Design a binder for this molecule. Structure first.
Ligand SMILES: OC[C@H]1NC[C@@H](O)[C@@H](O)[C@@H]1O
Length: 426
């Protein structure tokens, strides 16, 4: 009901042929690709698409985009799967209108989720209301990628236009968080799951960048201007300009000018505040800054990450500042960089010490021109699966049979992305 088994099986046959020298990769690729398509995607009563992030009836705007993105290739062939992806954009934009500050949404207005512990404005559609700038980038990215890869335009409907307007309004309000209607307190002993200053967050100055409460990891920002999410915002604001001009959408002149104004202001904020200096004295990107002079040197495996900046389309992989940042991220100068017997890579505040993330190994391969480095990382990913033949959230560098999240569809899909990239399937 969501795709053509005939068309998808033939496409996978072709990929397996292209990858015939890499049977270990094919086994995992097919397992990953089929599981997401068969077990996480459902068509709702209104013909729109709901994608399960994991193992409860809630969809993250972030995971759902990254889960479906690698199906864009076969959606060039499979018309029905093309509609399913369009239906996901439609669902995302509808939910953005329900509450543009929420990261995660229920399948229906059922009041499931975190309401018992969370003090914030809530409705029945909200699973979790952690505001993460990237949550609002991902649906815009998906709408744009669907259009570019397949030519599909039905996703650019009135709900799309209204939701785009909501995103621009919110990001603009959050250029000075003193004016924000958003507050968040969770009754928990885990500091990462709540906001300091009774739900308002840490101190900041106005920088031109847009404020975030939490990171793509779902843990709170230390400083409020998250460089990778503002990078992603700059990219998708470009997309908004393109889409409104091309499709002659309602209020395009106003929306295009607004998006451009905001893109330029965030870009100038990045120029003015996002940079710092590493141990060697090289200019690098910081992870989070507050505009008060504080700037962290680290990266988090969750995307958008600094490591993923070229993958997100923010800058060239060849860029000097990016490369210096990359060398810094992938070293012990980054406090989340962990080295062990099986692998070295990136952990997170979100997971245990010494556990590193497959998603960051995949992004590491997606952001190098060196095909030998891509192949090395793909070999490492499959070798570090604890014998499960799928991708986990994190695994211990000294023993990958110790890992978190048995079923992690976004991680499975990032592995698929790197295989396709290695094979020049584009
Ligand atoms: O998969 C849902 C959620 N898990 C924690 C992080 O990986 C975050 O990025 C993700 O959205």
């Amino acid at each position: 009901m969501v795709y053509s088994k005939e068309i998808v099986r033939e496409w996978l046959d072709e990929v397996a042929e292209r990858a015939k020298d890499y049977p270990e990769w094919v086994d995992v690729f097919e397992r990953c690709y089929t599981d997401t398509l068969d077990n996480t995607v459902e068509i709702l009563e209104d013909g729109s698409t709901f994608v399960l992030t994991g193992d409860i009836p809630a969809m993250w705007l972030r995971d759902s985009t990254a889960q479906l993105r690698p199906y864009l290739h076969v959606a060039k062939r499979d018309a029905l799967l093309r509609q399913t992806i369009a239906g996901l954009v439609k669902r995302q934009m509808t939910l953005v209108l329900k509450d543009p500050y929420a990261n995660s949404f229920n399948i229906e207005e059922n009041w499931k989720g975190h309401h018992e512990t969370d003090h914030t404005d809530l409705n029945g559609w909200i699973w979790e209301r952690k505001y993460e700038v990237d949550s609002l980038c991902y649906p815009l990215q998906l709408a744009y990628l669907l259009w570019k890869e397949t030519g599909e335009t039905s996703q650019f409907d009135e709900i799309f236009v209204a939701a785009t307007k909501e995103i621009l309004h919110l990001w603009t309000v959050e250029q000075d968080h003193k004016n924000s209607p958003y507050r968040f307190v969770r009754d928990t002993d885990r500091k990462e799951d709540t906001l300091v200053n009774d739900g308002f967050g840490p101190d900041f100055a106005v920088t031109g960048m847009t404020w975030s409460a939490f990171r793509p990891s779902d843990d709170c920002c230390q400083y409020s201007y998250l460089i990778p999410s503002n990078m992603f915002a700059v990219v998708v604001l470009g997309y908004v300009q393109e889409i409104f001009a091309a499709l002659n959408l309602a209020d395009s002149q106003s929306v295009i000018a607004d998006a451009k104004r905001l893109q330029d202001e965030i870009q100038e904020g990045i120029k003015n505040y996002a940079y710092t200096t590493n141990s060697k004295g090289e200019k690098i990107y910081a992870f989070e800054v507050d505009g008060l002079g504080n700037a962290s040197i680290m990266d988090d495996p969750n995307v958008p990450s600094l490591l993923a900046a070229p993958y997100l389309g923010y800058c060239s992989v060849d860029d000097e500042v990016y490369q210096a940042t990359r060398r810094t991220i992938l070293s012990s100068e980054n406090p989340y960089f962990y080295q062990g017997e099986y692998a070295s890579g990136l952990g997170s505040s979100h997971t245990f010490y010494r556990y590193i993330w497959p998603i960051a190994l995949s992004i590491q391969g997606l952001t190098t021109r060196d095909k030998a480095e891509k192949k090395f990382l793909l070999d490492q990913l499959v070798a570090c699966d604890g014998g499960t033949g799928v991708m986990h959230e994190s695994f211990h560098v000294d023993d990958p049979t110790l890992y978190s999240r048995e079923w992690f569809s976004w991680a499975n899909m990032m592995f698929c992305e790197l295989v396709l990239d290695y094979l020049d399937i584009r």
